[PDB]
Design a protein around this nucleic acid. Structure first.
Ligand code: ZN
Ligand code: ZN
Ligand code: ZN
Ligand code: ZN
Lengths: 81, 25
DNA sequence: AATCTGGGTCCTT
DNA sequence: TAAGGACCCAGAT
């Protein structure tokens, strides 16, 4: 459920989410992009970054099928609808 | 140090050393 | 203005 | 079933 960070005492929500918060203190970046060697504190941040290399666009507009890498681009797109 | 077991209170410097000890209990 | 940071919840074995 | 994986978002660079 939740835990207090033993460094700054802030309450961190989520079973398994304390390590990612601790790394905001330590600066450890355990995840590395295989292509451009850039490192990240979080697996999910690396995953979005790899879209730059794979060209993947998982955010799809149900009206016309326009495909985007970021949800805010999709949000911007939907004004035309 | 920052990775503390919530059952026996042993302190571990890295996350794996904490998760290595989770099998003891 | 676009993109990032850090923290939130849901799902799935 | 922990906790990995996925995704959202308010605020900041
Ligand atoms: Zn902290
Ligand atoms: Zn890369
Ligand atoms: Zn569209
Ligand atoms: Zn223990």
């Amino acid at each position: 459920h939740m835990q207090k960070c033993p460094i700054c005492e802030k309450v961190i929500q989520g079973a398994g989410k304390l390590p990612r918060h601790i790394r905001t203190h330590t600066g450890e970046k355990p995840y590395e992009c295989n292509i451009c060697k850039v490192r990240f504190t979080r697996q999910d941040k690396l995953k979005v970054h790899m879209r730059k290399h794979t060209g993947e666009k998982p955010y799809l507009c149900q009206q016309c099928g326009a495909a985007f890498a970021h949800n805010y681009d999709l949000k911007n797109h939907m004004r035309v609808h | 140090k920052p990775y503390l077991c919530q059952q026996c209170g042993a302190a571990f410097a890295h996350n794996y050393d904490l998760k290595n000890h989770m099998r003891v209990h």
